[PDB]
Every structure is written in structure tokens, then in C-alpha cells.
Amino acid sequence: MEMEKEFEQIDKSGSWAAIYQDIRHEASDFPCRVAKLPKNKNRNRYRDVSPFDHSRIKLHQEDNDYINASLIKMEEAQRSYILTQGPLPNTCGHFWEMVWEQKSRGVVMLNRVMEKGSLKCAQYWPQKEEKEMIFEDTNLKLTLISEDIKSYYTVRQLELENLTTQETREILHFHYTTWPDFGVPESPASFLNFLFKVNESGSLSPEHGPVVVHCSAGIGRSGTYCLADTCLLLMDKRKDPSSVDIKKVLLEMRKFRMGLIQTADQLRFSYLAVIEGAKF
Ligand SMILES: [Cl-]
Ligand SMILES: [Cl-]
Ligand SMILES: [Cl-]
Numbered sequence: 709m710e711m712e713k714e715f716e717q718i719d720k721s722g723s724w725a726a727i728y729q730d731i732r733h734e735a736s737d738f739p740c741r742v743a744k745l746p747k748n749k750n751r752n753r754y755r756d757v758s759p760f761d762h763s764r765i766k767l768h769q770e771d772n773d774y775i776n777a778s779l780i781k782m783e784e785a786q787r788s789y790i791l792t793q794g795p796l797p798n799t800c801g802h803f804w805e806m807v808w809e810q811k812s813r814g815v816v817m818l819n820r821v822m823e824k825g826s827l828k829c830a831q832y833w834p835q836k837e838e839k840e841m842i843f844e845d846t847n848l849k850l851t852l853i854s855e856d857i858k859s860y861y862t863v864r865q866l867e868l869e870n871l872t873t874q875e876t877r878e879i880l881h882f883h884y885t886t887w888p889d890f891g892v893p894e895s896p897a898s899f900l901n902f903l904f905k906v907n908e909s910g911s912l913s914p915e916h917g918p919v920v921v922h923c924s925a926g927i928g929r930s931g932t933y934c935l936a937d938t939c940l941l942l943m944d945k946r947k948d949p950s951s952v953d954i955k956k957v958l959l960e961m962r963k964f965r966m967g968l969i970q971t972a973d974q975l976r977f978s979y980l981a982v983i984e985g986a987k988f
Contacts, residue, residue, distance in 0.1 A: 794829020814911025931968030
């Protein structure tokens with residue numbers, strides 16, 4: 709209830725922008741030297757969103773280990789997430805190499821490939837069973853096995869094959885397809901349904917590698933997902949759920965990737981999701 713009382717006060721006083729800017733002022737700042745090397749320019753979608761050196765995911769490849777992706781290790785929640793930008797036309801092989809190397813079971817996608825004409829990520833998985841994809845640079849094959857299309861999101865069963873060894877893995881693609889072109893969803897019900905479905909699938913089990921979460925830059929909608937999921941985990945784990953301080957959780961996550969939650973509306977939406985999910 710305390711988080712809800714705080715929410716009602718913030719709404720009443722109109723202080724979402726002030727709270728959000730306090731977060732930005734306190735956020736950690738660590739170097740991103742590798743992301744800024746000239747040879748990595750075309751591996752970054754946005755010049756102002758980079759992974760920190762200390763938490764970036766390294767590809768196991770001799771020529772260039774760089775991908776714009778960060779390991780968010782929430783120690784108290786005992787859950788790890790990989791937050792990444794939506795893959796570029798030239799980094800789709802890198803993306804699936806990362807999924808393979810990190811042993812991830814689930815991919816969470818929070819955008820449409822094109823929004824208001826802007827390409828927010830490449831078409832990095834097959835839309836049709838009969839047109840599988842081959843990533844020649846990383847020697848991976850990806851096939852659509854089936855998909856379950858719902859009103860607010862789609863879940864896909866993908867088969868990822870390492871063509872070198874012929875080993876195959878099932879990857880679940882959790883695609884929230886209806887986040888609005890501008891702003892945040894009016895209600896968090898569909899987002900929470902989605903978040904619970906990811907958790908119910910087993911993809912977050914400590915038996916697998918970290919779930920991979922992405923949007924356009926990997927910080928705004930992805931930040932909302934990680935923040936809400938961590939907060940709901942903590943409420944389920946701790947003895948006093950009213951003890952969960954969403955701003956503190958968000959500052960902890962920002963130690964691992966810059967810029968998580970990109971507007972005061974996304975912050976308010978994260979509060980709504982956590983308050984409503986806490987009630988479940
Ligand atoms: Cl260079
Ligand atoms: Cl986005
Ligand atoms: Cl920011």
C-alpha cells in the first residue's frame with residue numbers, strides 16, 4: 709500500500725517529472741570505451757546509448773567481441789537479464805550468437821520492427837515456417853516452428869541450430885506487439901499478463917542463461933520490463949513487500965546499463981504495473 713500511497717501523492721502533486729529527473733541526476737556513470745571504438749560504429753543503433761565496459765556482453769569471436777548488450781545482474785532478486793538494442797541489419801548474426809553463447813531460452817521484444825516509419829529493429833526472426841533464416845557470419849540457422857498470436861502479444865516457438873555442430877535449441881520469442889506509437893499503454897493489464905506469461909514459460913529459470921530483452925535502444929521499454937519484473941520478484945521473495953523501493957531498484961539496474969526508463973511516463977507506468985501486479 710505504501711507504494712500506492714506514494715503513487716497517489718505523486719499524481720496529485722504532479723511530481724512525476726521531478727522524481728524522474730532526480731533519478732537521472734543520481735544515476736551511475738561508467739566508461740563505454742569499447743562501444744565508442746570507430747570499428748564498432750556500425751554496431752550501435754544510437755550514438756548516445758552504449759553498454760558500459762564492465763557489464764557488456766562479449767561475443768566469443770576472434771575478430772570483434774562487441775555487441776550493444778549489457779548483463780543486468782540483480783543480486784537480491786537472484787535474476788539476471790540481458791538488455792540489448794534491437795538488432796541492426798548487420799548485427800542479427802551477432803544477436804543470435806549471443807543467444808547461443810549465453811544459453812538463453814527466451815527473447816522478449818517490446819516494439820514493432822517499424823513504428824511511425826522508423827526502423828526500430830531488423831526483421832531478425834522468420835515470419836514464415838517455410839522461409840528459415842541462415843546467419844552466415846555466425847553459422848546459425850533459425851526456423852519458425854509455430855506461433856500463438858494474441859490480441860496484445862504473440863509467443864513464437866523458434867528452433868535455433870548451430871550449423872557447425874548441428875545442435876538445436878528451442879527458443880521462445882515473447883513479442884509484446886501493441887505498445888503505442890507515442891507514450892505508454894493506458895493500462896498495465898496487458899503488459900502484466902505478458903510479463904507473467906514470460907515467467908510461466910520457464911525461460912527465466914536459473915537452469916537457463918539470462919532472458920534477452922530488447923526494444924529500439926534497449927533502455928526505455930526494456931527498462932520498464934526489467935524494473936517491473938525485478939520489483940515483483942522482490943515482493944514475492946521478501947518478508948515485507950512494502951519494503952520494495954522502485955526508485956532504489958531502478959538506480960541499482962542503472963549501474964549495469966545507462967538510461968533505463970527514458971521518460972517520466974515510463975516511470976509512472978512502471979509504478980502502475982508493479983502496484984497492479986503486486987495485487988496478484
Ligand atoms: Cl577502431
Ligand atoms: Cl522502443
Ligand atoms: Cl536517462
